[PDB]
Design a protein around this ligand. Structure first.
Ligand SMILES: Cc1cc(OCCCS(C)(=O)=O)cc(C)c1-c1cccc(COc2cc3c(cn2)[C@H]2[C@@H](C3)[C@@H]2C(=O)O)c1
Ligand SMILES: CCCCCCCC/C=C/CCCCCCCC(=O)OC[C@H](O)CO
Ligand SMILES: CCCCCCCC/C=C\CCCCCCCC(=O)OC[C@H](O)CO
Ligand SMILES: CCCCCCCC/C=C\CCCCCCCC(=O)OC[C@H](O)CO
Ligand SMILES: CCCCCCCC/C=C\CCCCCCCC(=O)OC[C@H](O)CO
Ligand SMILES: CCCCCCCC/C=C\CCCCCCCC(=O)OC[C@H](O)CO
Ligand code: NA
Length: 437
């Protein structure tokens, strides 16, 4: 038993904060929907509108809490409060799962359909709640007595909106909807979160990593050390002669290039350069065992080093190589940080070293990688709000259906945590401020 003033206060704090936050989330999602319609924006707009509807019902639940559960408002307001409070409480979980799945699929695999999915979520929640209420609520179709719709009167002078509803009728309705709109979306969200984590881990490679580090030039240029270079970090020669560089360029492409090439030629030269670096590792006694023991992402950081310095230059880092085979990531990093390579190209070296430390693509913050990070944050954030806010409410529905001998204190706590989804949802969906751009 929570004191009425504490219950009133908790509902008022969720309402006072939820009203501006959801007004800001709707604004953010509407802007994105108008500029470039995306499934994520549609799901975020529906969740924003839903949470705002739940927000506006919170003062009514606050005064009910202050009246110790009695309905201190006109009886005709009970059906309106019923739909404004409970339809968003169940629909929200559906929109969070939809949003999490749209974010995961959009990022791991880089409009009209999303509106259909939202209409289906709203149709199910409104028909499920509507049919049970219209038919089985006190004052409903099956009720023959002079009773206001949704109102029970356990004692004289004490009308109760919904909370005194016969459990034999409300219980199976709450339980079935909790399975479909909370537990299934919870599994979907948990699946998308894991999928996002896995997509970050195996979604990039050496080719993409070297493109960021090397860049692209269609004409012969002098690199950082002054050597004639072309394409994607392809060293033509160390010789102080442009004619020698053009001569080497012509033999590599098999055409009279005159120091200028095509993107396809530069790409084909880059592929030959990566295979050469891979060949150099496998033919080296100190490199091959290290490479074989390494995961896919760390193998790429090893190829990146060989591509930049050559097999021999890399084989000289005997302490770091031993450390890497021993899986002593921080000790290898500390050794590589004292190298001439780090002194000469610190930005490039820090990125490769961080890749050896973490085994992730985090140092290579490309558009694709950032989109995947964003997707993981939304799905992780959705999982947290599902478990903390509406989660205790849906677990209470399941607990009471299986063990109806439980008292009503758990449901009372779950309804308060459910109300706080109006605060946590706009904070996790990412449409506040500048947006998820
Ligand atoms: C069916 C209906 C009839 C109505 O008015 C018709 C009677 C008007 S009259 C008397 O002038 O003829 C008004 C509404 C909003 C509705 C209506 C439509 C859609 C949804 C709802 C709200 O339904 C529900 C159902 C449940 C709850 C809350 N609202 C509680 C239970 C189960 C859920 C829970 O505890 O999780 C209600
Ligand atoms: C809407 C928030 C106001 C909640 C009331 C807080 C005061 C608590 C006292 C209640 C006893 C007197 C009954 C007060 C009824 C006033 C009419 C009303 O609140 O209507 C709801 C509004 O129209 C929605 O659609
Ligand atoms: C008829 C459509 C189904 C709606 C009725 C479901 C009943 C509620 C249960 C779970 C809600 C979870 C909804 C999960 C939907 C996944 C959404 C999604 O991933 O959309 C991808 C997007 O359209 C491209 O990027
Ligand atoms: C994908 C998961 C969807 C799961 C949906 C399951 C709904 C279970 C229905 C129970 C009604 C039984 C009530 C009768 C007992 C009294
Ligand atoms: C999986 C979804 C529905 C299966 C329906 C199975 C419902 C079984 C309920 C039996 C019962 O609650 O009695
Ligand atoms: C149990 C609640 C789930 C907690 C997850 C929420 C935090 C999201 C973290 C994403 C990491 C992506 C960066 C790598
Ligand atoms: Na070393």
């Amino acid at each position: 038993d929570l004191p009425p003033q504490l219950s009133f206060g908790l509902y008022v704090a969720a309402f006072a904060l939820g009203f501006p936050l959801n007004v800001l989330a709707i604004r953010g999602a509407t802007a994105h929907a108008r500029l470039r319609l995306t499934p994520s924006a549609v799901y975020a707009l529906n969740l924003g509108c839903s949470d705002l509807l739940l927000t506006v019902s919170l003062p009514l639940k606050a005064v009910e809490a202050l009246a110790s559960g009695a309905w201190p408002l006109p009886a005709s307001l009970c059906p309106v409060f019923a739909v404004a409070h409970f339809a968003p409480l169940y629909a929200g979980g559906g929109f969070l799962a939809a949003l999490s799945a749209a974010r995961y699929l959009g990022a791991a695999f880089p409009p009209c359909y999303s509106w259909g999915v939202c209409a289906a979520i709203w149709a199910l929640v409104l028909c499920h709640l509507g049919l049970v209420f219209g038919l089985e609520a006190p004052g409903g179709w099956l009720d023959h007595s002079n009773t206001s719709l949704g109102i029970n009167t356990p004692v004289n002078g004490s009308p109760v909106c919904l909370e005194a509803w016969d459990p034999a009728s409300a219980g199976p309705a709450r339980f079935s909807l909790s399975l479909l709109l909370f537990f299934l979306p919870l599994a979907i969200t948990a699946f998308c979160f894991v999928g996002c984590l896995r997509a970050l881990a195996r979604g990039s490679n050496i080719f993409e990593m070297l493109r960021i580090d090397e860049g692209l030039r269609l004409k012969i240029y002098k690199d950082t050390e002054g050597y004639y270079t072309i394409g994607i970090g392809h060293l033509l020669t160390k010789s102080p002669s442009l004619n020698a560089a053009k001569s080497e360029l012509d033999k590599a492409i098999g055409r009279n290039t005159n120091g200028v090439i095509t993107k396809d030629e530069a790409e084909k030269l880059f592929n030959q350069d990566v295979d050469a670096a891979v060949r150099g590792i496998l033919r080296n006694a100190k490199l091959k065992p290290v490479y074989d023991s390494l995961d896919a992402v760390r193998r790429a950081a090893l190829i990146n080093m060989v591509f930049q310095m050559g097999e021999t230059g890399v084989a000289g880092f005997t302490n770091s190589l031993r450390m890497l085979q021993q899986k002593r990531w921080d000790e290898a990093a500390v050794n590589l940080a004292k190298s001439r390579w780090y002194n000469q190209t610190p930005n490039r070296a820090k990125r490769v070293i961080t890749t050896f430390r973490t085994g992730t693509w985090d140092a290579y913050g490309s558009l694709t990688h950032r989109r995947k990070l964003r997707a993981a944050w939304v799905a992780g954030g959705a999982l947290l709000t599902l478990l903390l806010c509406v989660g205790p409410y849906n677990a209470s529905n399941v607990a009471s259906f299986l063990y109806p001998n439980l008292g009503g204190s758990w449901r009372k706590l779950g309804l308060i945590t459910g109300a706080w989804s109006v605060v946590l949802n706009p904070l996790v969906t990412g449409y506040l401020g500048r947006g998820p751009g």
